[PDB]
């Protein structure tokens, strides 16, 4: 819990999925006190890929990563950045069902 005072920057740890969409992907984690924005860094997972990773900075705890594809796994880091420094990195292990035809 937090004591309840204002000094430190206590990077995102609710991370959850708000929603799994084989087109989108939607997350949602809590709050920083003292950060102004966060930094989002959407990388794959996977070694295979030309586009380099993706770096956005959002107002809201909440990011929505439009155009993906079903049955891939990403990796999104969250900062909480408030200026000069900012706050330990944390991220989820993103996923993606598949849609259309299921082939065994």
């Not at 950060?35 to 860094?41: D, E, I, K, N, Q």
């Not at 990563?65 to 891939?72: F, H, T, V």
């Not at 950045?81 to 991220?91: D, I, V």
């Amino acid at each position: 819990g937090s004591s309840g005072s204002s000094g430190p920057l206590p990077p995102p740890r609710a991370l959850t999925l708000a929603a799994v969409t084989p087109r989108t992907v939607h997350l949602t984690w809590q709050p920083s006190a003292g950060a102004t924005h966060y930094l989002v860094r959407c990388s794959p997972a996977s070694p295979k890929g030309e586009e380099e990773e993706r770096e956005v900075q959002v107002g809201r705890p909440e990011v929505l990563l439009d155009g993906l594809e079903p049955g891939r796994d990403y990796e999104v880091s969250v900062q909480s950045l408030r200026g000069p420094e900012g706050s330990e990195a944390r991220g989820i292990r993103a996923r993606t069902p598949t849609s259309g035809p299921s082939s065994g």
